[PDB]
Amino acid sequence: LSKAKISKPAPYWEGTAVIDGEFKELKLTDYRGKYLVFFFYPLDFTFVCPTEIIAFGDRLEEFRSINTEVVACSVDSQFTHLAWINTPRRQGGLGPIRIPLLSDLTHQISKDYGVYLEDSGHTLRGLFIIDDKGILRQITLNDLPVGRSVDETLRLVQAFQYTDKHG
Amino acid sequence: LSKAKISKPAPYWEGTAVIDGEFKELKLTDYRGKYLVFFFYPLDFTFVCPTEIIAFGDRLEEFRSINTEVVACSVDSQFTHLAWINTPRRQGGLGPIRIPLLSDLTHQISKDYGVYLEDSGHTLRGLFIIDDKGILRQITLNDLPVGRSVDETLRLVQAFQYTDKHG
Amino acid sequence: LSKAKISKPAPYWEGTAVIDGEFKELKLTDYRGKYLVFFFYPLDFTFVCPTEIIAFGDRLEEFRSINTEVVACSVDSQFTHLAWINTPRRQGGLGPIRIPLLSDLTHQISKDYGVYLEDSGHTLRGLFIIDDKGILRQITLNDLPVGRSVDETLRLVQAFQYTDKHG
Amino acid sequence: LSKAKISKPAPYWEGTAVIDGEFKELKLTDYRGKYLVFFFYPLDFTFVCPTEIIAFGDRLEEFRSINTEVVACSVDSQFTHLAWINTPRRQGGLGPIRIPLLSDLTHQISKDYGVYLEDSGHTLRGLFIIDDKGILRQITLNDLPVGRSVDETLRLVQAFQYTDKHG
Amino acid sequence: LSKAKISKPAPYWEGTAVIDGEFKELKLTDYRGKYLVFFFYPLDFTFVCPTEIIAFGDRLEEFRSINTEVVACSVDSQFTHLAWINTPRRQGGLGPIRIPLLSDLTHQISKDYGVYLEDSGHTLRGLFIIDDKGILRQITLNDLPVGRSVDETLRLVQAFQYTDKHG
Amino acid sequence: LSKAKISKPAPYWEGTAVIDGEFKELKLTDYRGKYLVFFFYPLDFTFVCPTEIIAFGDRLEEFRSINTEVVACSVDSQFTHLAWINTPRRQGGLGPIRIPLLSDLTHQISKDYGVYLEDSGHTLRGLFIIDDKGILRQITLNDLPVGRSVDETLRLVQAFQYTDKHG
Amino acid sequence: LSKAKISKPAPYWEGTAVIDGEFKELKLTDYRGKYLVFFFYPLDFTFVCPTEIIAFGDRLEEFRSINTEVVACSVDSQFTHLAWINTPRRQGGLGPIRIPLLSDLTHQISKDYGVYLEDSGHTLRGLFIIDDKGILRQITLNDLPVGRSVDETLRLVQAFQYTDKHG
Amino acid sequence: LSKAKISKPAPYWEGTAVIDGEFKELKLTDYRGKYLVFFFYPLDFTFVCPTEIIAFGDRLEEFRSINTEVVACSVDSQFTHLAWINTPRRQGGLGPIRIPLLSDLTHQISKDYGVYLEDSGHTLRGLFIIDDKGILRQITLNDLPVGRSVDETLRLVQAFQYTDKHG
Amino acid sequence: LSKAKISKPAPYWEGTAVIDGEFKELKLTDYRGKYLVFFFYPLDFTFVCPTEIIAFGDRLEEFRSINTEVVACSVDSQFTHLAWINTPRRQGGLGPIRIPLLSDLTHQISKDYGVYLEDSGHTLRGLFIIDDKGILRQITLNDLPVGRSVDETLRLVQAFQYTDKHG
Amino acid sequence: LSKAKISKPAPYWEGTAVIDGEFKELKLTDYRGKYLVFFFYPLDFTFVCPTEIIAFGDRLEEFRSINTEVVACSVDSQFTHLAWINTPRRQGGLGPIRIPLLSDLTHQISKDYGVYLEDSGHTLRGLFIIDDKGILRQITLNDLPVGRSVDETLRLVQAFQYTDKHG
């Protein structure tokens, strides 16, 4: 059963992420004081260019300049994430990336967030906006075929921040 | 608990809607053969301009030109919906509108779509994209202070229709 | 199930009421030391003139001069109550009113009083007489098509007060 | 628990009544095709004048002329009812009466109608209005010290009949 | 279910009795230190002469002279008991009587003693002999058509007292 | 629990009885068409003369001449009943007897009649009057020290027969 | 169900026994410090000579000379046991006997030792050897037609006592 | 739970036995038409001479000449039984033997017969006499230290056979 | 909980494998008529040389020449397996391989074989030998730091085939 | 159900073993501080040469020189193990042996290790490698016809010790 509810604390997670090419333990609470865009994608190493992850990474400062961080997550192992990062974009790899890739190998994070697909063994395309107090503000769930927009994500983050300030 | 699951038939609903200023019985199955943008908003007659509903109403041909209908819903009675429509926009009303306003007075529809707020008695801001075969493709849930984008909604419908065709 | 039982404390309620054009928190316990006539009606903004609510409001001093207050309640939001108050009587509205209009948006009050209609999402016409000690003395439940009498209500209040004094 | 619910069939009853000084088997269904005013009172042979039963008997033709019957019930035996009737009014009795007095000796009718007082062994003052199709239309429950009004009962019956015919 | 068991404490009872034409609170425990003959009969005001109650009243001194009291009970109200007593014997009444008449209006005493007839709402003819320590010594249950004997009751009470003293 | 209920079929029993010095199978149904006095006593061979059983046997024609039979029962074996019968009265035995002595060695009959004492392993003194149709009409339960009266038993049988005829 | 298990304390029992023609309270714990042969037989006063009980009685010194007591038990009352003892052997009695005859009138002892016959109401032929520390050492159960041997019982006691000493 | 009850069919068993030095499947039903002495002993290959098994085997014709067979059983495997039979008596072995040695390796037979010792993993010394119709007639359970007598077993078999014939 | 039991059908599995650089559906029953060595390893793309997989790949003809196939499985996706195969050995890839790599992305195969590590989200090193009838013959489970031996695997397979043919 | 789990404490066992021709109590924790190879085999005294046990016995110094002990276990009693050891190899015995033979007569050790065959009453061929801290490192289960390899067992032990020391 999903733990993710709007206006309640975002469900706690921890696990191993690849950050600047290294394995680091990462925890939701590491982001307190900041907004967090926390998003899931199905699988590393598929035959489709990972356009949506590349967009977030390549535009990361439009988030960081407004006190917002981004973390991407799939059910792949941290070893697979690293191998994918070390595969050049021109071979369909991710290439070097400035966003943590969190591993959800046990599937517990995906199940807690309601994005796990039992019959397939990976997630759908789920995106969560979590405020600086750790409260879940937004849930976006897409069927597999359709990606997320950085511009829409920024719009939502900027609006939650505006409304936090001018209540 | 919520019955809305991506890739499954969207939860059936029926109720009274205000359409072109008249009460009409409306059913989810009335939309079979078309895409449907089905969204919830909290309450009629609040002190905030209904910008988002006005936007979908002004830009409705952009959906209809791609075989897509739009339905809005709140927990308000059909009588309240009709009064809000009949209240001019400059007096805090909605004014004439081209999108059906569905009443979920029993709260069953809101509960089935996972958008009902037990402590408040109305919905959060939830939007669902349902395809022409009645299958749920997309779920967007926003905390109360933040509205929806017609552009983003349009991009998602177009992308689902594209991937349906060339999938 | 209904908690309203003759000779027991009337079930506690609290919510937002419209009182002289403003939102106020109102509680049952605010009425200790006075008799209270507490009545439900189905919906704001219907096509029938609200004759029964108008009568209680317009004859309110016949209650106040015998240490009795009146509170009307429906499942409509406080925003809808306010819009209805601000709709002139000769356009079908309530117009200005002296009696509080309590919102039961969550349906919990209506359920506690055994007046909620599950299939419709609103109440029947229920009226309750509560004494100055908070004890329920009288229950009147009418099917939808038939309203209440101010004169019968006064007879009942006067009889309970008389028997309280000379029992 | 009470089976009496507005808009549902009134709970079936049968038992022995005193009608014109004779024991008769009486059933709720005997009244199909007519409105019925069915009321309970606590006990025979108390030291209070039975004003309300006398008023209903005195004014019975105002009910029969609008296709309505009246039945009174208490938990007393039929033998008690008959003795009370046979006791002159000045001597603490009811005297002759044209309203059936139904015995609820088993207490089952009083429990089904939600008027039984478990700590006392008799009912409070409950009155019920049942239509010609056997559907419950109105529930009135009074704490012991306050009686019912023939005029109010007539107003209710006339309104239900008018709305049945004219909507 | 019945709580009356030979050699166990007789089930506790309390209620309102008519004693010498007055309402009095009566308790089983009021009789500690004496034997008690406690009997039930079905109903007041039937068309049968109440021969057995009259016989017990007529011969009461044969009990009091051996430290024994007698109490009669039916499901009728205390108000019924008083009216029956106040109705002359030739006129269908009991007339004046020196035995308390206990009301079991709630039916709880009759159920505890196993004498209640659920389909009728009154008791069969049960008689119980309770010693000075409050211990049940004897149960006599008769189907409705056959009464009790004062002589047999005296024989039983005298035998219990003789065996209590002489073994 | 006891199956013996006034106005219902007396509980079925069968067992081995001593009848005129011989073991015979005896069943309740053997007595259809006659009234039956069926009574239990605690134990054979105690130090008290069996006066009550002797009285019923010695006065048996006062029952037989009014179409009534008598059966005595205890928990003793049929072998013990026979030895007791073969013990002269002036040595404390029963001597020859005309009434069957039923054995309830398993305790099932005693339990069915609600006369079994769990702590002692025998019955109290219980007596039952059963009509010619097999219906239980009367129950008499005495604590151990006090016996039954042939004369009271005849009065009861005669009363039930009289009311059966002229009810 | 049976509580008798080899190597565990023999199930506790107590009851009234006939010892030297007098009633005595007897308990299993009275035998602590001695071996005990505890055996059951079906019924007193049958038409079979009580050969086996007579044998244990005639040869009782052979047990007492090796610190061993013998107790016999049936479901018969102590009163029946005493009568059977007082009946001369030539008239189908037991005659004077040196072994206590324990009564198991409630059947609890038989049930605890696993020897009770539910369909018959008495025991089969069961024999138990209990050591001086109260532990059950041997269980012998015989269908009704076959008796026990004193010699065999003696061999078992002697063998248990031998192995106790040189174990 | 033990299935072995006197007067009921002996619990069914089957398994591998050593018979004349060979493995044979053996079943309780193989013995229909004959009495069977069926006995358990703890373990093969202990340091005590198997005197009691040797006695049964060496005196086997005192059983077979009266239509009676003997089977011995332990929890040892059939391989261990065979190895034991092939160990000479002068080395504490069984030597050649004419009685089947049944293996109860799974423990199901021992548990069905109530002879299994959970803490030890083998049986106690249990012996069962089963008649020619397969009915259990006798149960003998000995604590470990004490053996069975062939002479007692013959006495019991001869008595069941005598009583089967002269009922 | 594990379904894998020696001498029972090996648990059914199906999924996507990489075979000669392509995705192919594969199921357990594809191997009916052949022996199957089915083994799990923790993870692709780790920092330890995949020596054991390379060893089975290199020596695959020693299996095929004795009617035996080999399948390897981890929890990694098929896409990851393909990427790992397409990574040269000199960069910590597997390189070209002749053994199918099965994906257990859902973890259901691993759980069914009892090799899944709930705290880690991958398997330990389990190896299973399944015969040509689909029956499980051998289970080998190694803690993570220790690998499997092709020589020991071949010994086992040959011994099962030898014992299948020669009893 | 099996308690044996890789990386968890090996299930505790205790019982009687034969060590150098004598009975000794043995428990798992006697081996703390050493590696233990713990293995089960089906049965003593079967017709197949005990080659694998002889092999571990013969090569025991290869284990002891790497701080490792070896214990073999079957369901046979200790007495049977001793008899099997005392039977010369040339007659299908084990002969002298340096490995403890543990008895699992109760079958509880076998069940705890998941090696027990309920239909047969003995184990399959299971082998367990337990480290010096008592943690289970390896499980090998073979169907009955195939034995274990000392060489593979030594490879595993050495690899666990190597990986324990060098990470």
* Burial (0-12, 13-18, 19+ Cβ within 10 Å), H63: buried
Cβ-Cβ contacts under 8 Å, I139 against chain J: 139-141
One-letter amino acid at I11 equals P
Please tell me which of the candidates D76, D107, D118 has its beta carbon nearest to residue E77: D76
CA angle C54, C60, C63 (to 5 degrees): 135
Beta strands in chain D (DSSP E): 14-19, 22-27, 35-40, 68-74, 101-103, 116-117, 122-123, 125-130, 136-142
Q: What's the gap in Å between the CA of I139 and the closest CA on chain A?
A: 24
Distances (CA, A) of A32 to A28, A133, F46, H24: 8, 6, 91, 77
Instruction: Say whether D75 sits in a helix, a strand or coil.
Output: coil
For E24, list phi and psi in degrees, rounded to 5.
Answer: -135, 140
E35 neighbors E84 (Cβ within 8 angstroms): no
H/E stretch holding B79 reads helix B78-86
Distances (CA, A) of B33 to B63, B67, B68, B154, H121: 14, 8, 9, 18, 73
CA distance D50 to D125: 12
Distances (CA, A) of B48 to B80, B92, C34, C102, D65: 16, 8, 38, 22, 57
The b/e string for F3-29 (b: 16+ C-beta within 10 A; e otherwise) is: ebebeeebbebebbbbbeeeeeebebe
Q: Which two tokens stand for residue C89?
A: 């009587």
Instruction: Say whether F18 sits in a helix, a strand or coil.
Output: strand
Q: What's the gap in Å between the CA of I146 and the closest CA on chain J?
A: 6
Instruction: Say whether I150 sits in a helix, a strand or coil.
Output: helix
For I39, list phi and psi in degrees, rounded to 5.
Answer: -135, 150
Length of chain F: 167
The conformational region for residue J46 under phi > 0 = left, psi -120 to 50 = alpha, else beta, is beta
For F75, list phi and psi in degrees, rounded to 5.
Answer: -70, -10
Q: How many CA atoms lie within 13 A of E18 on its CB side?
A: 22
Give the single-character DSSP code of J114. Answer: T
Give the single-character DSSP code of D167. Answer: -
Sequence-ordered alpha helix ranges (H) in G3-136: 51-58, 60-64, 78-86, 108-112
Query: For residue A120, what is the nearest residue in chain I, using CA coordinates?
Result: I106
Cβ neighbors of J36 (< 8 A, separation 6 or more) are J28, J68, J69, J70, J71, J128, J129, J130
Judged by a CB distance cut-off of 8 A, whether residue I81 touches chain A is no
Judged by a CB distance cut-off of 8 A, whether residue G86 touches chain F is no
A45 neighbors A10 (Cβ within 8 angstroms): no
Q: Which residue has the tokens 């535009």?
A: A59
Distances (CA, A) of C140 to C59, C67, D63, G116, J104: 20, 21, 21, 67, 79
For B42, list phi and psi in degrees, rounded to 5.
Answer: -70, -60
* Burial (0-12, 13-18, 19+ Cβ within 10 Å), G114: buried
Q: Which residues of B are tagged catalytic?
A: 49
CA distance A99 to A70: 6
CA distance B51 to B54: 5
CA distance G83 to E90: 62
Judged by a CB distance cut-off of 8 A, whether residue B33 touches chain A is no
**Contact criterion met (CB < 8 Å) for H143 and G156:** no
H99 neighbors H60 (Cβ within 8 angstroms): yes
Q: Partners of E74 in the beta sheet?
A: E103
Q: Which two tokens stand for residue C42?
A: 């189905």
Q: How many CA atoms lie within 13 A of E109 on its CB side?
A: 30
CA distance G116 to G40: 10
Q: Which two tokens stand for residue J2?
A: 């099996």
Q: Which two tokens stand for residue D98?
A: 């044209």
Q: What's the reported resolution, in angstroms, to a tenth?
A: 1.9
H/E stretch holding F157 reads helix F150-166
Nearest alpha-carbon partner for A53 in A82, A4, A93: A93
Q: Partners of G71 in the beta sheet?
A: G38
Q: What is the bridge-based pairing of β-strands D125-130 and D35-40?
A: antiparallel
Q: Which two tokens stand for residue E150?
A: 């004062």
Cβ neighbors of J165 (< 8 A, separation 6 or more) are none
Length of chain A: 167
**Contact criterion met (CB < 8 Å) for A122 and I87:** no
Domain ranges of chain J: 1-167
One-letter amino acid at B69 equals E
Judged by a CB distance cut-off of 8 A, whether residue F83 touches chain G is yes
CA distance C40 to C25: 18
CA angle E114, E117, E120 (to 5 degrees): 165
Nearest alpha-carbon partner for B105 in C45, D138, C89: C45
F26 neighbors F70 (Cβ within 8 angstroms): no
Q: Which two tokens stand for residue G76?
A: 């018969």
Assess whether chains F and E touch, using the rule of 3 or more C-beta pairs within 8 angstroms: yes
CA distance G129 to J129: 50
CA distance F141 to E140: 6
Instruction: Say whether B64 sits in a helix, a strand or coil.
Output: helix
F81 neighbors F18 (Cβ within 8 angstroms): yes
Q: Partners of C119 in the beta sheet?
A: none
I104 neighbors I15 (Cβ within 8 angstroms): yes
Catalytic, out of G49, G66, G144, G159: G49
Torsion sign over Cα H45, H50, H56, H59: positive
Q: What's the gap in Å between the CA of D114 and the closest CA on chain C?
A: 10
**Contact criterion met (CB < 8 Å) for G106 and F120:** yes
CATH of A1-167, one of 3.40.30.10, 1.20.59.10, 3.40.50.300, 3.40.50.720: 3.40.30.10
Torsion sign over Cα H64, H68, H69, H74: negative
Cβ neighbors of A166 (< 8 A, separation 6 or more) are none
**Contact criterion met (CB < 8 Å) for I105 and A75:** yes
Q: What's the gap in Å between the CA of F148 and the closest CA on chain E?
A: 9
H/E stretch holding G50 reads none
For J122, list phi and psi in degrees, rounded to 5.
Answer: -140, 180
Nearest alpha-carbon partner for C99 in C61, C66, C70, C130: C70
I137 neighbors I4 (Cβ within 8 angstroms): no
D34 neighbors D67 (Cβ within 8 angstroms): yes
Judged by a CB distance cut-off of 8 A, whether residue B19 touches chain A is no
CA distance B100 to B21: 9
Q: Which two tokens stand for residue D79?
A: 């033998």
Q: Partners of C142 in the beta sheet?
A: C125, D138
One-letter amino acid at I7 equals S
Judged by a CB distance cut-off of 8 A, whether residue J154 touches chain I is no
* Burial (0-12, 13-18, 19+ Cβ within 10 Å), G157: buried
**Contact criterion met (CB < 8 Å) for A76 and I77:** yes
D68 neighbors D34 (Cβ within 8 angstroms): yes
List the subunits that have 3+ CB pairs under 8 angstroms with A. B, I
Distance between alpha carbon C49 and the CA centroid of its chain, in Å?
A: 17
CB atoms within 10 A of CB F134: 16
Q: Partners of F83 in the beta sheet?
A: none
CB atoms within 10 A of CB G166: 7
Q: Which two tokens stand for residue E145?
A: 């058509």
**Contact criterion met (CB < 8 Å) for H45 and J121:** no
For helices D150-166 and C150-166, the axis angle rounded to 10 degrees is: 150
Distance between alpha carbon H120 and the CA centroid of its chain, in Å?
A: 20
One-letter amino acid at B106 equals T
Judged by a CB distance cut-off of 8 A, whether residue G55 touches chain H is no
Torsion sign over Cα B73, B77, B78, B80: negative
